[PDB]
Amino acid sequence: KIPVEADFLYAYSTAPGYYSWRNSKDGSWFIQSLCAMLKQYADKLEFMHILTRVNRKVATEFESFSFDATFHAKKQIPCIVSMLTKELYFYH
Amino acid sequence: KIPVEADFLYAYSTAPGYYSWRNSKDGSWFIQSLCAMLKQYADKLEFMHILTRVNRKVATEFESFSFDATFHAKKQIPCIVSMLTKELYFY
Amino acid sequence: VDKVD
Amino acid sequence: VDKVD
Amino acid sequence: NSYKMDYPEMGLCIIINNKNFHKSTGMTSRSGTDVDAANLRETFRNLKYEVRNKNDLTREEIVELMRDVSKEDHSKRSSFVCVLLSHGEEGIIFGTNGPVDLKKITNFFRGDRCRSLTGKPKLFIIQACRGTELDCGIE
Amino acid sequence: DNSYKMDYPEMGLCIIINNKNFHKSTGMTSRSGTDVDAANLRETFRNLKYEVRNKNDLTREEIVELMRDVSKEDHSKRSSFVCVLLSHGEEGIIFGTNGPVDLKKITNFFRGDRCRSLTGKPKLFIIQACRGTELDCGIE
């Protein structure tokens, strides 16, 4: 037997409770970062280390720009929730 | 600037919504497993890979034994929640 | 511009 | 025996 | 160790891209989500996934799609990927006409309810709000 | 830059809150086995060079008070921070000996803007506690 909740991974764009951010032109910060880290490291790194790079890119390279001061200069951290039981590599 | 919620890791013993299991003699399945994997691997593996091995140990090596058939033969999966921005090596 | 989901 | 937390 | 990823197929990558919402929701259209859905299609194509883009699905269409996908034979597939691009709130993703529990979506793929994925990684990528807090940042 | 700096003079604190015996007025069972956990954790994190502090049978007030105090220490020379919570719980909730505490109230003390000497450093919370009442029947 294994648990019925095992081997799930939820890559959330943002932490529990928080807004998630999206740029009108370039797309959402999270998905932007995810595709770039996958492009750059899917042949190099285990998936959780790729998502960790995604966390740092969203955390460091993005900050909200809004004409509404309420929503301006805000930050975002994604949230990796792993019930996986093994390392996940997209290469051979 | 970095988010104020960045660089947190929450290693939950069980999935959201679920009971977590503890053996009256040996201690909780999760802490038993976490100490074994850190003992075995903290000198070699990045922390998320250690916690992934804790997941597999708890998922495969433990099953509940209870006199209450309602609570017998149950399983558990821990839940790694990472807002870390870098890899964590304990050496 | 940045918008919220 | 096993107990729940 | 590592998930076995050398099945004949890497697997499915389902992308649900909700841009336009019913007025009853009060939700604004999500400008830039098309760029997301195209970026993801290309990214997972290079990872040898069988990609399926779906656009503007109601909460009922999402549940039915997820049910149908979970009923397929994933026996020759290494993994399963689902990407949700939408408005949301904690534990909740929005169809074009209203909210859906994320747990209801993911329950279809539970190891006891989707036997041809038991033991295989099930990845849910979720771009959606989870509340209304803002992170002001530090330093 | 890809790895946390872990060569500060100290690895950091490791706070272990071990709640075994609960006020009967809460209705919660004694957590047999948890002393075995608390000791296993102390030895483990001792070998990792953490300054381990074990606290036993804390009320919700003592937990909040301890967490505020620790978060107001000077961690400038510490690489990281580890907190281990062993107790009953529900989703989002850890129990002191006399009632519930939101985990978020605890974690907020160490939040990047409220504990500056930990900004940029990994803050690890290890939680042995229930998160509701669902049972996982498994699959064979």
How would you describe this structure to a colleague?
The complex is a heterohexamer, with 2 copies of chain A, 2 copies of chain C (5 residues) and 2 copies of chain E. Chain A has 92 residues and is of the alpha+beta class. Chain A is built from 2 helices and 4 strands. Chain A has helices at 29-41, 47-61; strands at residues 8-12, 21-23, 27-28, 79-82. The longest helix of chain A has 15 residues, at 47-61. Chain C is an all-beta fold. Chain C contains no helices and 1 strand. Chain C has one strand at residues 2-4. Chain C is rod-shaped. Chain E has helices at 33-46, 59-71, 102-107; strands at 9-17, 50-55, 77-85, 88-89, 92-95, 98-101, 122-127. In chain E, the strands form 2 sheets. Chain E has a 4-stranded parallel beta sheet with strand order 2-1-3-7, with helices on one face. In chain E, strands 4-5-6 form a 3-stranded antiparallel beta sheet. The relative contact order of chain E is 0.23. Chains B and F meet through strand 1, strand 3 and helix 1 of B and helix 1, strand 3 and strand 7 of F.
List keywords for this structure.
heterohexamer, A: 92 residues, two-stranded antiparallel ribbon, C: 5 residues, mainly beta, 60% strand, rod-shaped, hydrolase
Beta-strand content estimate of chain A: 15-25%
Radius of gyration of chain E: 16 Å
The arrangement of helices and strands of chain A along the chain is: EEEHHE
**Structural category of chain E:** alpha/beta
Form type of chain A: globular
Tally of separate helices of chain E? 3
Order of helices and strands of chain E: EHEHEEEEHE
Shape of chain E: globular
Largest interface summary = B-F, 49 and 50 residues
Strand content of chain E: 25-35%
The counted number of beta strands of chain A is: 4
Helix content of chain E: 10-25%
Overall number of domains of chain E:
1
The first-to-last residue Cα distance of chain A is: 28 Å
Protein name (chain A): Caspase-3 subunit p12
Organism (chain A): Homo sapiens (Human)
Modified residues ((Microbial infection) ADP-riboxanated arginine) (chain A): 22
